[PDB]
C-alpha cells in the first residue's frame, strides 16, 4: 500500500554546491522523508551515486519544437506588362481593321477582335499576324520561365543540423537546466556550433520558463524554434490550438526511472516490476493514454473565375444579338 | 533475473525499412484536373447552346470536338478566346511547376 | 528497448561498470562512438 505525496520544494533532485544538500524528491529519499520516488526523475550519474535507479520506464531526449492570394498570379507578369500587352492587343486589332457603312465597321472590328482573341496572303496584315505571334510567343515564354523560378525557389526544419546550417530561423533553450548545460558542455560537431550561436545571439534566445518558450514559437510565425525535452514536447503537440510539432529525432538518449533509497528492500522488486510492465506493453499503453488518447489534437482558381466571367459576358452578347435580329 | 544489467548504453526499438505515375498527378493537383474537366464540359455546353433530339447529340459531339482542344459569331467567339487564354495559363503553370520539380527533386 | 553491459549476479565489477556507462553517456562519449561507426565510418 502507498500514499502519494507531493515534494515540498517542488524540485526534482539537485545538489547545492555550498551546503552540499540534496533537494526535491532525490533529497526526501536520502534523508528518509520518503520510501520511493515515482516521477519523471532523470537517471543521472550524480544521483545514481546517492540513490538507486530502476531500469528506465521511459526513454527520451532533447527535441526540436517549431510552429492563396490571387496576387501571386498578377506578380509573375507585372501589372504594367498586362497593360501594354492589352494596348498592343487593340493596337493590332485596329491596324488589321484598317486593312479590310458604320455597321460594316462594327462587324469588322468584332472580327478583328476575334482575330485578336488569340489562336488569304495579304502581305500587309500578314506580317502583322506573324510579328504579333512572335510577340505573344516571347511573352508566354517569359511568363512560363518566370513562374518556374518562383516555384523552383519555393521548393523544413528536419534535423538539428538544419538549425546550424541556417540563421533565418532563430532558436534557443531554457535559460537554466540540463538542456542548456548540454550544448555548453557538448563536444559534438553540430551541437557545438549551435551553442556558439545561442551563446551570443541577440536578443536573448533563452526563455525564463517552458511556457514562455512555447509562446515564443507560437508568436514568431515559424521564425523561432525551441529546444526542450521530447516528453514535454510531444505533450504540447497534443494541446490546443495544436500549432506546435516535434521535428526530427532526439539529440541525446536519456531516461526516467523509479528512485529508491540506496540499499532498500523495494529496490530489486521495483526494478523487475518496471521491466515486467514494459514487456507487457503496459508502459507504452499508459503513455498513449495520457499523451495521444487523452490528447486534444489558389492561383489556378483565379484563372477559373476569369473564364466563367468570359462565358457570362458571351452569354450576354448572345442574348442581345438575337434581340436585334 | 539471472545476471546484472548496467544502465542502457544505447536505446533502440523496432523500425521500418523501405526502398510511380503519381509524380505526374502531383504537379497538377487532382482537384485541379477535376475543375479543368468541369469547366471543359462547362464550355462545350455553353457552345452547345449557341448553335430534334439527335440534332442536339450531333452538336454536343461537335462542341465536344471543339472542346477536345486545338465564323465570327462574337458570342461564342470570345468563349473560344477566353477558354484558350485559360488553358494557356494552366499548361504554362504545369510546365513551370514541373521544372521546379525537375530541379530540386526532393509513402 | 536498450542494450547494456551484462555482469554475473553479485559481481565486483557490477556497480563500477554501471556508473562507468552513465559517465560515458554524459560525456557524450557513447553518442560519439555511435557516430564514429554508423555515420562517420559510413559509406552513405
Ligand atoms: O530529473 C528531472 N526530470 C525532469 C522532467 C521534466 C519533464 F519533462 F517535464 F517531465 C522536466 N521539464 C521539461 C520541460 O520543461 C519543464 C520541465 C525537467 C526535469 N528536470 C530538470 P533539468 O535539470 O532541466 O533536466 C530534472 O532534473
From Swiss-Prot, chain B:
UniProt PTM comment: Palmitoylated. Depalmitoylated upon L-glutamate stimulation.
Triggers of expression: Down-regulated in the pyramidal cell layer of CA1 in the hippocampus by global ischemia.
Sequence ranges marked intramembrane in UniProt: 55-70
Superkingdom: Eukaryota
Transmembrane segments: 30-50, 74-94
Subcellular location: Cell membrane; Postsynaptic cell membrane; Postsynaptic density membrane
Known tissue expression: Detected in forebrain. Detected in dendrites of neuronal cells. Expressed in the pyramidal cell layers of CA1 and CA3 and in the granule cell layer of the dentate gyrus.
Function: Ionotropic glutamate receptor that functions as a ligand-gated cation channel, gated by L-glutamate and glutamatergic agonists such as alpha-amino-3-hydroxy-5-methyl-4-isoxazolepropionic acid (AMPA), quisqualic acid, and kainic acid. L-glutamate acts as an excitatory neurotransmitter at many synapses in the central nervous system and plays an important role in fast excitatory synaptic transmission.
Family: Belongs to the glutamate-gated ion channel (TC 1.A.10.1) family. GRIA2 subfamily.
Domain statement: The M4 transmembrane segment mediates tetramerization and is required for cell surface expression.
Misc note: The postsynaptic actions of L-glutamate are mediated by a variety of receptors that are named according to their selective agonists. This receptor binds AMPA (quisqualate) > L-glutamate > kainate.
UniProt subunit comment: Homotetramer or heterotetramer of pore-forming glutamate receptor subunits. Tetramers may be formed by the dimerization of dimers. May interact with MPP4. Forms a ternary complex with GRIP1 and CSPG4. Interacts with ATAD1 in an ATP-dependent manner. ATAD1-catalyzed ATP hydrolysis disrupts binding to ATAD1 and to GRIP1 and leads to AMPAR complex disassembly. Interacts with GRIP2. Interacts with GRIP1. Interacts with NSF via its C-terminus. Interacts with CACNG2, PICK1 and GRIP2. Interacts with GRIA1 and SYNDIG1. Part of a complex containing GRIA2, NSF and NAPA and/or NAPB.
Name used for this protein in its record: Glutamate receptor 2
Gene name for this UniProt entry: Gria2
Full-sequence range covered: 508 to 653 of 883
